[PDB]
Symmetry: D2
Subunit: 312 residues, 4 copies
């Protein structure tokens, strides 16, 4: 089983990633780290513990990370109408899963320096401030990391801006730091995750599993889908999971090796992931971007995982 560390900011997307990681036999979830994002770190951490409780994950540490982006201020942009805990779901009086005592950054450095080299695969699905920190704090980790698979960015697509994606836009500096280290980086951006649609056929499929987790996922997804993408006439889509999926089977998506950098001072482009697809491509490129997604193989994995989790 491939050992990984899931750094996230729990929203349905991140939650589904956690289910997939836990549910799949090919993945060995080493720990779940949390980072500030659209919602405060605390809010996000609570959500993490809630999904951990629902998926009945035990033995896997959960640690809260950075509360602020490296340099940019955070736009709290809070306004969830019918939101209580996560979506319409409320938090239980007590949480089954407890919070690890150390800061997410320390945990990551610890885990990496504890296990054998090229064993752990980092999978960030939120801002990269947590990762960026560990890199500057413990340089020896970038060489020990097998590789980095993150959900974020977009070479020809953007949401937070015409050309930028949230996870990156949120803390451009952290993104830059990460993208410029000597390690291997696989960027699963919007261009990709946009293909991971939640067609009604898929919903029927998951609903068929008929487990508390399945129901949970659907309910929350539906709630948030309504608020965002349900403003238009087209299905919702999950992103974060796509990163985990790749780690499980590289054939779930096509990728292209092209250099990628982060714009940090552009009046209109700050936060954009610049990808050089130009004529002669460099022979050695530690970075690559996801392109086409295998719709079926992807969803099958999700369902399969949900089935495996069952009803804890």
């Amino acid at each position: 089983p491939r050992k990984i560390i899931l750094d996230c900011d729990p929203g349905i997307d991140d939650a589904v990633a956690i289910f997939l990681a836990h549910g799949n036999p090919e993945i060995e979830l080493l720990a779940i780290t949390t980072v500030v994002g659209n919602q405060s770190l605390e809010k996000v951490t609570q959500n993490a513990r809630l999904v951990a409780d629902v998926a009945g994950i035990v033995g896997v540490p959960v640690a809260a990370g950075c509360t602020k982006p490296l340099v940019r201020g955070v736009r709290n942009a809070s306004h969830i109408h019918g939101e209580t805990g996560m979506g319409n779901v409320s938090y239980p009086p007590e949480f089954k899963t407890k919070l690890d005592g150390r800061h997410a950054v320390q945990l990551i450095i610890d885990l990496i320096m504890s296990h054998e080299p090229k064993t752990i695969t980092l999978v960030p699905t939120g801002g990269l401030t947590n990762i960026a920190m560990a890199v500057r704090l413990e340089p020896r980790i970038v060489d020990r990391v097998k590789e980095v698979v993150l959900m974020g960015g977009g070479y020809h697509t953007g949401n937070a801006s015409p050309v930028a994606e949230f996870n990156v836009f949120i803390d451009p500096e952290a993104a830059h730091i990460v993208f410029n280290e000597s390690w291997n980086v696989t960027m699963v951006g919007l261009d990709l995750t946009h293909l991971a649609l939640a067609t009604p056929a898929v919903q029927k499929r998951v609903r068929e599993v008929g487990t508390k987790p399945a129901a949970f996922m659907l309910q929350i997804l539906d709630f948030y889908t309504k608020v965002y993408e349900k403003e238009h006439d087209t299905y919702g889509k999950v992103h974060d999971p796509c990163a985990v999926a790749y780690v499980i089977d590289p054939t779930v998506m096509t990728t292209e090796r092209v250099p990628v950098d982060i714009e940090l001072n552009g009046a209109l482009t700050t936060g954009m992931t610049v990808a050089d697809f130009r004529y002669p491509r460099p022979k050695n490129c530690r970075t690559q971007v996801a392109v086409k997604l295998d719709f079926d193989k992807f969803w099958c994995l999700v369902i399969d995982a949900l089935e495996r989790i069952g009803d804890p």
Copy 2:
């Protein structure tokens, strides 16, 4: 016939545009203005007069414009090996077509203010510094212009940089000015002009015309194709003409109405044409980008024009 003003920096691309404008009965070439570009203004102006002589264009003024970009310094980047005049073609001792006495900017302002409103269509195919100047000098012109169709930019493609196109990168400021005026702008970028390939089938076709101008076009095209795109294993392509083609028949290419702006201070993005393809598109958009091109219809027009010009 649609009245237009062709602002360019004569290189084969620009030359073909001139042939198409002149040769087509649907277009009424009001004047040919010139701007500094990859080559000096003078060099470029000489080239204009040469093609004017070859196409036997008479009665149409030719005026030289700005010699430097608004704010950016110009990278002369000159190094043409077997280049004499234009490609391997040399300049005649004297030019048949003479140079208008006024500066291109003035000529433009004059023409626009002379003819009736919404009659002239501006068609820049080089930097936009000439157009930007006229706008700031005589504001009344932006309302009198029917519309602006320019070859330049690229929303998902770039050459001068991973994300920027020459004509824009060369003078970002000028582009910005142009793209931010209240007038209608149709941007024919790389994404489009890339489809305008010069397949051998096409060459055979033009060579079949068998006129001095046809031969001229081929000879020069071949020469420059060799230097640039002939460094790899794929045909060359003409760009500039595409802009002229659109004016002749909007059905030569599909377009999309989306907001566009110019990044002016991005460390990696300066010069990029930022296009917002995001979810909800504004109802009123004076700007649109070219997407798919009608290969056949396009080339047919070019051939047709060459045929019409004949041998002056």
Copy 3:
């Protein structure tokens, strides 16, 4: 007499400059050009004609220039409480002085190209967009200009921003263009004009002149002083005039030859005039900044001029 061209955006400061130019025998006012600024171009032009009428200036053309900055949008920031025409003074039904038929930019190029080389001294006291245009339109002028003395910028002082002065901040691009041409530039910035205080002693002095123009100057100055600097407990100060003063007598202020450039893309520094006072100064420097001002010599000139104008 030193021939000059006064490019301004009439506010009391610019008005006093006009008085000084007109009133002084050492200066030969060739023309008065107008540029957009804190107030619209039209507003500013009207003001110019009004002071021209008051100072009884005849034979000197007045031309309206650019209505918008080169690239930056203009912040109209209009909110003058008791403002009618200029300050509390109202416009007469008709203006004695008429408006020249050509655009300020053209007038400038014409004058320069008409007179003999190194004869005209350009004195801008508003945004530099007017000058910048002329330079790009007719390159031959920068060699024919004796030199450039402008009121604007600040090496250790700022007002529109912690580090930038209005005239420059308003149209950074224009400033940039001007500061990077091969001609001689004397920058009279805030560091200098801040010393030009309107102590009560000075007011008494000017009031003593007892002429319509004197009264006018005082009334307007007082009105505007109240609104701005009169928010604090310290006298008002005139700026623009200091530039003209220098042309009349270089010994009115001390200057330092140091390189100067314009920041165009700094998040906090855009518009700042960067001055390199560092250790080894270049031997050849076409730019210099004003430092210390001769308070008495300065004011004496102003009074003397007012005295000379008299009551037209």
Copy 4:
């Protein structure tokens, strides 16, 4: 005694600071942290241990910090001609003072969280990357810190650039983070440290102390003075110590409370410490800049401290 933590990048300046902190009875040196700078972190750390050995400092932990700036790459710029260890002084086979096991960042967080609130005063005299890290990792520390006194920046002076000082220019981001936290910041910039000259009178004075440390200081100072400032005809100056001096006696220098920020994306201004000295100053300002220095009082403190250290 005022408790402090000295974060530095040992060069003579930093060394003198250490001597002053140690030697002065009013200061309680809690620990000495190290940051990458002009020289590598390791190089810098070795130098710290060397001065520690020379000053006979015992009981005070020494910890190495970050090896790279947050986001900017480091310009190693190494080329010391007659440099062996520190200046012409060589390292002993073994170091008396040992290196604390934890990373400087951790040590700082530990110390702060250990002692009582508003007890420790942070005194960084090198890049601020170390401080910035701790702040992002353990937010609770900014409230517990008494205040921040750092040597770096320049409001009207610069060295690394016409407008920027090294310590800040080296890692702009870090600086920004620090200057924008809710804690009190006292910036001792070039404007100030420039007045701390090492006149021959002073040298004679210190040489009079006649101790190994005094000799050490002089020898190194002389060596580096020769390389840098000795390229011109003016004495050398110590900077870093001035920060320490202020903590010992605020009356050693005059300060002004004015807002300060860090430019991060200016083409010419990146790294500059922007200080708003404009008309109305905010009532509440957690930041202030050093202005005039008490030459005698300063040196007296240095001498006194050297005297107190004696010959370990």
